[PDB]
Amino acid sequence: PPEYPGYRPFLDPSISPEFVVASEQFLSTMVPSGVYMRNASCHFQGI
Amino acid sequence: PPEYPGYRPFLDPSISPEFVVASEQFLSTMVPSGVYMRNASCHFQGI
Ligand SMILES: *[C@@H]1O[C@H](CO)[C@@H](O)[C@H](O)[C@H]1NC(C)=O
Ligand SMILES: *[C@@H]1O[C@H](CO)[C@@H](O)[C@H](O)[C@H]1NC(C)=O
């Protein structure tokens, strides 16, 4: 993202309904079927 | 002023009370005491 320009008191920060689809409903294409568990030193069998 | 970037639906265009002073109340320093009248070809005695 572009660097911080400063506080803009006139920018409207509201959330749009299209943002609910672009961000949250899109993340489901990446959710896996199982999730691992790991040691502190490379051991995966459920800690 | 900078060139037109495009319609920003989120910019707040409201008028501020400081704009009433910066623009309108400042113009009084330039109003003259009398105003001329002119011909179409450089004649000033009240047309
Ligand atoms: C990794 O797991 C083994 C056995 O599961 C355990 O002995 C060891 O302490 C674990 N490593 C760490 C850093 O806790
Ligand atoms: C300028 O004024 C004179 C007399 O006041 C008049 O004869 C003349 O027509 C005027 N010029 C124009 C372009 O009207």
Task: Determine contact: A37 vs chain B, CB below 8 A.
Answer: no
Is residue A10 within 8 Å of residue B11, measured between CB atoms?
yes
Is residue B18 within 8 Å of residue B26, measured between CB atoms?
no
- How far apart (Å, rounded) are the C-alpha atoms in residues B34 and B44? 13
Ligand 1 closest atom vs CA A41: 13
- How far apart (Å, rounded) are the C-alpha atoms in residues B42 and B47? 9
Could you tell me if the CB of B43 is within 6 A of ligand 2? yes
∠ Cα B36 B37 B42 (to 5°) = 105
Q: What is the resolution of this structure in A?
A: 2.7
Task: Determine contact: B11 vs chain A, CB below 8 A.
Answer: yes
- For an interface test with A, give the residue of B11, B14, B16 to mutate (most A CBs within 10 A): B11
Is residue A12 within 8 Å of residue B10, measured between CB atoms?
yes
Could you tell me if the CB of A41 is within 6 A of ligand 1? yes
What method was applied to determine this entry?
Answer: cryo-EM
